From a paper:
The transpeptidase LtdMt2 catalyzes the formation of the (3–3) cross-links characteristic of the peptidoglycan layer in the Mycobacterium tuberculosis cell wall. The structure analysis reveals that LdtMt2 folds into three domains: two domains in the N-terminal part, both of which show an immunoglobulin-related fold, and a C-­terminal transpeptidase domain. Combining the structures of the two fragments provides a view of the complete three-domain extramembrane part of LdtMt2 and shows that the protein extends at least 80–100 Å from the plasma membrane into the peptidoglycan layer and thus defines the maximal distance at which cross-links are formed by this enzyme. LdtMt2 (Rv2518c) has been reported to be expressed at the highest level and has been found to be essential for virulence.
The structure of the AB-domain fragment, which was solved by molecular replacement to 1.45 Å resolution, reveals that despite a lack of overall sequence identity the A domain is structurally very similar to the B domain. The structure of the segment comprising the A and B domains was solved to 1.45 Å resolution by molecular replacement using the B domain (residues 149–250) as the search model. The structure of the AB module includes residues 57–250, approximately half of the extramembrane part of LdtMt2, and 309 water molecules. Each domain in the model contains a bound sulfate ion located on the protein surface. A structural classification of immunoglobulin-like β-­sandwich domains defined four subclasses, s-type, h-type, c-type and v-­type, based on strand connectivity and topology. Both immunoglobulin-like domains of LdtMt2 belong to the c-type Ig fold, with strand orders a–b–e–d and c–­f–g in the two antiparallel β-sheets. The similarity between the A and B domains is reflected in the Cα r.m.s.d. of 2.7 Å based on 85 aligned residues. The domain interface accounts for 350 Å2 of buried surface area including 13 and ten buried residues from the A and B domains, respectively. The domain interface is formed by the loops connecting β-strands β1 and β2 and β-­strands β5 and β6 in domain A and the loop connecting β-strands β6 and β7 in domain B. The two domains are connected by a short linker Ala149-His150 forming hydrogen bonds to the main chain of the B-­domain residues involved in the interface (Gly236 and Phe237).
Residue numbers in the entry: 57 to 250
Amino acid sequence: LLVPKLTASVTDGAVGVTVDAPVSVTAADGVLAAVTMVNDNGRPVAGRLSPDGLRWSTTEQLGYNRRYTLNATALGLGGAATRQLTFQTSSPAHLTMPYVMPGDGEVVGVGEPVAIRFDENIADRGAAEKAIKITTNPPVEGAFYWLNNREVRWRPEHFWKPGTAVDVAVNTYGVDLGEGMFGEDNVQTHFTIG
């Protein structure tokens, strides 16, 4: 007969915790009976408990420069377990907001690149690229190229084909884009090649 086991995806006393991923808690040999997370001013963080009670996860954006307190209780045939932990999230030197072109909902020509322009210097171009997901349909191969320290573009080898959906997810919220420059938020754009 085992006592329930709680496992969180963050450690107690962690610092610099990145806010580009949710925080989770799992139970084994039992189910989650209560999970709460609050910030340093006592504001609850939204989360979702799976219907089977085995996993809870945050469902909204954690803030920069915050201390979060997580409490969980699991209950099983073998008794109860509780855990509390506290951690601190990333403290950016600066924030940068990206702007994507073409604009959301636009219909554009066969020579138009995807362009992602950040409003501050990007010292880690590789980190910025990794945070950007391009979807094409019909699918075509393409690649990123930087114009300068602020603007990265993406295109196929030659021209686009008319009737192509292009989806651009710029997910740099929580990502250190070099020298403590973090994404201010995520951006989502979808357009069509006419």
